[PDB]
Design a protein around this nucleic acid. Structure first.
Ligand SMILES: [Ca+2]
Ligand SMILES: [Ca+2]
Ligand SMILES: [Zn+2]
Lengths: 541, 346
DNA sequence: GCTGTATCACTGTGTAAGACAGGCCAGATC
DNA sequence: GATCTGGCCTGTCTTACACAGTGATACAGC
């Protein structure tokens, strides 16, 4: 016979129904006599341990503006917003937990892992020290999810580093093996709304921001392995693409003259001063600079006001860390040098102002030629597989064999090896130790790229430049000094999680458009527990 | 009884329910866009003109000295025609905070019909109200002097009962009356005995020394009563005085739309009778120096969508002209965000 | 010989909004 | 009657948006 927990990990981790499992159970029990799979209600009672809302816990002090109950389940996402005919119209459905009650189950599911970490790091298993938990938040619109459009946004988090302050220093009691994968970012709220429908987006995400600002100055006491233990938290909201950090932190839209969400520069100025910047955009500076926008205390006109406020025009309402995404940086660089391949087919340094017909021919011969050489699939939107496959030396040497002139051969090969020399020190999840020498050589490695853009490629990069290339040069040797890692602080897990939403949506629903957003949340919670993923490595352990 | 269908410019997307339409000098201006102000129209307030049922939301700019203000989504506006200007207070910002500032909105310049606005953040000092929306404010006169009378709408829960499962829950404000002087911006609250219930989305008429309030929803009882209230106000050189009276024969409609089609004769159009029954009829309120009354007009004709949609919204353009909006059915040939109509009553 | 992973060849388009620069043009202006 | 500017329109340029997943087959251990 089996535990209820193993067959729970089965029925979740291979997407059976609420009824197909009954067929499998009744056939196995009818054939082999003994029951091997636990029945349905005995599975359902074993769900409730793993959901949020089962265990006692308390805060020091009790939290301001938070209800103190411990027996909350899934709560409605509107936070009791009245949806009446007399007032503003809302039509979105959103579901969520609380934020404390999710962190409770997120810490208590990794109980064996932090205890075994305490064992392996030579410390008392009967310890009750003040742990610090580092939580990374993520949020993305994952729209066009309908069936025979409609958009949806999940806001989600990730337990990433649990660290005690023992004696004179700290120890990594728990560290996450694979940070940016799909099975270790846990769903916290989900909504059916546009990711730029700013009213409803703010109206749902403001409770979680309130609770997050609440639990930044308290402690959690929790019965953890016999004795109780205490946790304090540190939040870093990082899982955002350029659009969402550009929006909810309240800058201008993405086509602004002011580019960087970390420093303050213009593209007519960034294209000359390439690497002398720093991080000069906080969240509090952003908030008070919105205030000095709104007051206009000097009475200057709009065009130099926006010069003084450096292109802030809105009230930010979500504290983010100013930090790059890892995935979308690589996708942007990939599509950029794919377009520069398409342009250098035409060799337009010889003749400028080419027609808007021959460029389509350059695209067509690029796609046909790279399908001939390396078998790239003719697509439009660059996915992750296409992004990984385009940045090889074989393809640039192939199109180098396509292009006529000789200086373009050195100009593309040297650039490709410089870029691949730059790539893994942001691509890695711990590049401070894995390639720790080119990490130190990165300054020269970057300014050579910069000088050969500004000299041998000055036909295009004398005026405008794009966004992500400014982030690659200007910031990442300082981001490794501040935060350390790069690729761990990405949204790749959150970006990968979206297929699970669709599969859960068309395989587990009750067709009411209100419980339909309950059960996808419940199943996605039951997916990403580490108490059940420990069972799916039993054939590896 | 003159319905007319309107077509739209290139950016229909700057519409949203609960906007604000300001009438300056015959010109019409739009304030309260959807979302934060874009880069093509940085003030978020527009010269809104309509030629041959086609409208051109052109951007409007501000003065040297103005204070750029966020697009409120249900504010309280009134007409300080004493230069000509408007007063904005309250509303709900894009981040669903509730503002409580005073915004003095006037014309700074107009050269070759290119308008130039100036708004100033008049701050309230003294017995301020809580920040709220769905409230109303009228300007009023007595004995060479003038004041602002403010009656409340609804707001959030207070700062102690804000739990994060009721974080966007709302309750009616206290039935107080707020007297405001704008020479210093001083605020005096007043408790008044004949008003018992909180009211929201009501209609306020200022007959030059007396404000009549008709309609509006009471959320805590979850009904829309048919009670109108006449409020007499007078200021001596010492402390001013207020008075309330209940005059029977009102109408039970929340969030109707008012305009002035005649002097001492106003006109309200269709709102909501019940939560499922909208107000289909439309009324001409014949005012008076002391005695006012309310009669019906000759039932303006609608179309299929207006008789078919669940909701409507809109405001008045100022010159006897009502602007209305309609959601439109989504399960269609990718139908537009909103449809638009103009009502004219001659 | 048996089994447990690792490929493997398939599949699918160009949108959706939004900022910034010139080109033109058309009535306003001197 | 010349001569101007802002108004509108293109018109490119920036960020996002679907490729993961299924039978068949092939190799590496065991
Ligand atoms: Ca995104
Ligand atoms: Ca995405
Ligand atoms: Zn920068």
């Amino acid at each position: 016979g089996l535990q209820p927990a193993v067959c729970l990990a089965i029925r979740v981790n291979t997407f059976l129904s609420c009824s197909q499992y009954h067929k499998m159970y009744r056939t196995v029990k009818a054939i082999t006599g003994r029951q091997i799979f636990q029945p349905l209600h005995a599975l359902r009672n074993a769900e409730k341990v793993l959901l949020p809302g089962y265990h006692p816990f308390e805060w020091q002090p009790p939290l301001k503006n938070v209800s103190s109950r411990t027996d909350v389940g899934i709560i409605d996402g509107l936070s009791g917003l009245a949806s009446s005919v007399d007032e503003y119209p809302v039509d979105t459905i959103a579901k969520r937990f609380r934020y404390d009650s999710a962190l409770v189950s997120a810490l208590m599911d990794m109980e064996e892992d932090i205890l075994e970490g305490m064992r392996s790091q030579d410390l008392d298993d009967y310890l009750n020290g003040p742990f610090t938990v580092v939580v990374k938040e993520s949020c993305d619109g994952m729209g066009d999810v309908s069936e025979k459009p409609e958009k949806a946004v999940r806001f989600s988090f990730t337990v990433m580093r649990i660290t005690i302050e023992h004696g004179s220093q700290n120890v990594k009691v728990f560290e996450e093996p694979k940070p940016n994968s799909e099975l270790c970012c846990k769903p916290l709220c989900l909504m059916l709304a546009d990711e730029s429908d700013h009213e409803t987006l703010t109206a749902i995400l403001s409770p979680l921001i309130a609770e997050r600002e609440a639990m930044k100055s308290s402690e959690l006491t929790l019965e953890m392995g016999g004795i109780p233990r205490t946790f304090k938290f540190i939040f870093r909201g990082t899982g955002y693409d350029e659009k969402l950090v550009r929006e909810v932190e309240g800058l201008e839209a993405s086509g602004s003259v002011y580019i960087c969400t970390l420093c303050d520069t213009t593209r007519l100025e960034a294209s000359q001063n390439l690497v002398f910047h720093s991080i000069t955009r906080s969240h509090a500076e952003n908030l008070q600079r919105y205030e000095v926008w709104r007051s206009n205390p000097y009475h200057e006109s709009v065009e130099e006001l926006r010069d003084r406020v450096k292109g802030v025009s809105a009230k930010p309402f979500i504290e983010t860390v100013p930090s790059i995404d890892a995935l979308h940086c690589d996708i942007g660089n990939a599509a950029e040098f794919y377009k520069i391949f398409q342009l250098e087919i035409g060799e337009v340094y010889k003749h400028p102002n080419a027609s808007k017909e021959e460029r389509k021919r350059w695209q067509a011969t690029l796609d046909k030629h790279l399908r001939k050489r390396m078998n790239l699939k003719p697509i439009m939107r660059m996915n992750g597989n296409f992004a990984r496959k385009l940045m090889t030396q074989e393809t640039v040497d192939a199109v180098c064999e396509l292009i006529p002139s000789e200086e373009r051969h050195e100009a593309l090969r040297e650039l490709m090896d410089l870029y691949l020399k730059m790539k893994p020190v942001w691509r890695s999840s711990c590049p401070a130790k894995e390639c720790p020498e080119s990490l130190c050589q990165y300054s020269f490695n970057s300014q050579r790229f910069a000088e050969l853009l500004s000299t041998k490629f000055k036909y295009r990069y004398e005026g405008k430049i794009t966004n992500y290339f400014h982030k690659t040069l200007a910031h990442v040797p300082e981001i490794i000094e501040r935060d350390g890692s790069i690729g761990a602080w990405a949204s790749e897990g959150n970006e990968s999680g979206n297929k699970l939403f669709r599969r859960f949506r068309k395989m587990n629903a009750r067709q009411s458009k209100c419980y339909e957003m309950e059960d996808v949340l419940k199943h996605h919670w039951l997916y990403t527990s580490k108490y059940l993923q420990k069972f799916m490595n039993a054939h590896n352990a | 009884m003159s319905l007319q269908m309107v077509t739209v410019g290139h950016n229909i997307a700057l519409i949203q329910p609960g906007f604000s339409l300001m009438n300056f000098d015959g010109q019409v201006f739009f304030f309260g866009q959807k979302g934060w102000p874009k880069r093509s129209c940085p003030t978020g307030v527009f010269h809104f003109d309509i030629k041959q049922n086609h409208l051109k939301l052109k951007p409007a700019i501000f003065s040297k000295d103005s204070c750029y203000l966020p697009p409120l989504r249900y504010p309280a506006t009134c007409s300080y025609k004493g230069k000509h200007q408007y007063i904005i207070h309250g509303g709900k910002t894009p981040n669903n905070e509730l503002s409580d500032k005073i915004y003095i909105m006037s014309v700074a310049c107009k050269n070759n019909k290119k308008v130039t606005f100036r708004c100033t953040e008049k701050d309230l000092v003294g017995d301020v109200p809580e920040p709220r929306y769905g409230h109303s404010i009228d300007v009023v006169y007595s004995r060479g002097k003038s004041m602002g009378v403010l009656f409340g709408g609804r707001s959030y829960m207070p700062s102690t009962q804000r739990t994060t499962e009721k974080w966007n829950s709302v309750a009616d404000c206290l039935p107080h009356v707020f007297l405001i002087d704008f020479e210093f911006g001083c605020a005096t609250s007043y408790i008044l005995p004949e008003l018992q219930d909180g009211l929201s989305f009501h209609v306020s008429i200022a007959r030059n020394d007396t404000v009549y309030i008709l309609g509006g929803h009471s959320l805590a009882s979850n009904i829309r009563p048919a009670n109108l209230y006449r409020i007499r106000v007078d200021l001596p050189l010492g402390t001013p005085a207020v008075n309330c009276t209940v005059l029977p024969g009102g109408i039970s409609v929340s969030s109707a739309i008012l305009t002035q089609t005649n002097n001492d004769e106003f006109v309200i159009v269709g709102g909501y009778q019940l939560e499922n029954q909208k107000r289909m009829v439309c009324s001409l309120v014949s005012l008076g120096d002391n005695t006012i009354e309310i009669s019906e007009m000759e039932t303006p004709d609608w179309t299929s969508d207006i008789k078919h949609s669940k909701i409507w919204f809109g405001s008045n353009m100022g010159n006897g002209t009502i602007f209305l909006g309609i959601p439109g059915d989504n399960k269609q040939a990718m139908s537009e965000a909103f449809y638009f109509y103009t009502l004219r009553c001659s």
